[PDB]
């Protein structure tokens, strides 16, 4: 029931990760628009997301598609897109080729389908519940090693953030002086997908909307990774998700400094 | 006389980088040795060090070659040679491919040659004193930015450090609130070419050893970048570099926390 909704997912993924590609390089600082105090989004990412939700909505008429930059359009249904038409805007802005495309696909509140496309590599991780999780057809899994010396961990966490920076500050000197390394790639849907890889054993980023992870959640979760969700789901939300052994110290970290 | 050493090194940085192509995904955990409190190696640093230097060698056979795990080989000379024969190991055992290859080579006091090699996106960053800086025989600059909010700034420092944590996470918070992102990829010559070639703004890594920046030093000086080196250059020293604009904005976030000379 599942695979006619993951194979769109792929294709709008696909079409978005287009105008990433035809425009990588392009945008100049008068084409970038402030959001907020320190976010940018350009004509990228708003013709990116005009391409998947006219891709979803062909296939699927009666769904509701939420976009990080142009908001809901929809009904009322059960099913429900989320859709980061350009995750790591600063980073393509700059040139650093770690950005993506999340399409995601929720039943309820239940995360079901998800791909995750980065167009600089051409690498498509997708995934749906029961199906497994792969990247560009083979099948990823989350890394088994417990020890935390050479486990590595991702992380974000905003400037300018609703928590004190000394709650991130905190979580992160603490699991930093004792995994292996610790890396900042600066899109948290990347993120997701190499715990699901398995390259990094763990992360935890901080501040997330439901485009940001709801993809990266589905293939985290068919990959055999674990999470936990910290906030409401449909609003700013903090993700810590690893193998089980990572996600567990990074939680037991977390909540020596925030309620989780 | 530039020219000569500067083909040698990205040929050596080459013969290196094809022992990391090879081995890429096949480290276990058997392999791994353990050096200090955190840092790793493996029969992959190591061979990839004895390809480089042996390039180096054949070609100047008087020069000095340094590299990051099995020391120094030579007579003394003015031309000394600093490698770092993996740059990146933990990425590179985890299987993320933000590694390269460095080959520095320092005249006296003076760096005047340098390659850098990725082996996974094989790009080859080269430069020397007054000939320029290239990616794949592509010339690269610094970015003109002067706006902190669209700076982009990379950073590094390490987990059991010489310094208290603190200084490091001050110096990071409040690069971090003025900048437009700050980024951690984890492989300092990476960082330095990526500065280079127009990509990040600034950055800044902290105690670093010389075969982790020569070879970039040279890159981002012909690039037109700028840069300051705290502590001694032939020891553990921290680099602070960007453009103009992102290289005077981090040096003075430093200076309120460490002494910079
Ligand atoms: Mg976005
Ligand atoms: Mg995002
Ligand atoms: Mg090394
Ligand atoms: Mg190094």
């Not at 809901?72 to 350009?86: C, T, V």
């Not at 050479?150 to 920076?165: E, L, M, N, T, W």
């Not at 709650?167 to 002086?177: A, P």
Request: glycine letters at 12%; proline letters at 3%.
């Amino acid at each position: 029931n599942l695979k006619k909704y993951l194979e769109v997912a792929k294709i709008a993924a696909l079409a978005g990760g287009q105008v990433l590609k035809e425009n990588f390089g392009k945008v100049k600082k008068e084409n970038i628009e402030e959001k907020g105090e320190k976010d940018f989004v350009s004509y990228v990412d708003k013709t990116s997301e005009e391409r998947i939700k006219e891709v979803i909505l062909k296939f699927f008429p009666d769904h509701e598609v939420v976009g990080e930059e142009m908001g809901a359009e929809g009904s009322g249904s059960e099913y429900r897109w989320f859709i980061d038409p350009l995750d790591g805007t600063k980073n393509y802005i700059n040139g650093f080729p770690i950005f993506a495309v999340s399409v995601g696909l929720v039943k309820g509140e239940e995360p079901i389908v998800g791909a995750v496309y980065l167009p600089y590599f051409d690498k498509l991780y997708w995934g749906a519940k029961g199906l497994g999780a792969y990247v560009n057809g083979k099948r990823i899994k989350v890394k088994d090693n417990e020890s935390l010396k050479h486990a590595g961990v991702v992380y974000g966490f905003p400037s300018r953030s609703r928590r004190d920076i000394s709650i991130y500050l905190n979580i992160f000197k603490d699991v930093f002086y004792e995994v292996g390394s610790m890396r900042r790639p600066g899109a948290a849907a990347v993120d997701l997908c190499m715990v699901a890889e398995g390259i990094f054993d763990g992360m935890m980023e901080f501040e997330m909307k439901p485009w940001d992870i709801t993809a990266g959640l589905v293939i985290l979760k068919e990959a055999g990774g674990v999470y936990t969700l910290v906030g409401e789901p449909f609003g700013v939300s903090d993700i810590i998700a690893g193998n089980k052994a990572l996600h567990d110290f990074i939680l037991q970290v977390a909540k020596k400094y925030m309620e989780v």
